[PDB]
C-alpha cells in the first residue's frame, strides 16, 4: 500500500529522421571500402559511393 512513483518512456522508433540520440563517437566517412555502419542506429556493411 505504500505510494510508488511510476514513469514510462515511449521510444517511438517510427521511420523518420533522427531527432534524439545518445553519446556521439562519430568519425569521418571513407570511400570505396567496406566498413561497419552506425548511421543513426542503422547498422550494416558496404562501400560508400
Amino acid at each position: 500500500y505504500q505510494p510508488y512513483r511510476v514513469v514510462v518512456l515511449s521510444f517511438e522508433l517510427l521511420h523518420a529522421p533522427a531527432t534524439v540520440c545518445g553519446p556521439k563517437k562519430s568519425t569521418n566517412l571513407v570511400k570505396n571500402k567496406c566498413v561497419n555502419f552506425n548511421f543513426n542506429g542503422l547498422t550494416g556493411t558496404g562501400v560508400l559511393t
Binding site: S10, H15, P17, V20
Partner: protein, 49 residues
Amino acid sequence: ISNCVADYSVLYNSASFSTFKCYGVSPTKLNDLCFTNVYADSFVIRGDE
C-alpha cells in the same frame, strides 16, 4: 523530449528503481540508438498495481 542529446548512462546508476522492466528494446544499448520521438509520463500510485 526532442531536438537534444540524451545521456541515459548516468540515469542508470543515478539511483535504484523498484521495478525496471524494458519492453522491446534492451536497456544497456540505448546510448547507441537514435529515437525520432520520446515521451514521458511520471506520477505516483500504490504498490499492488
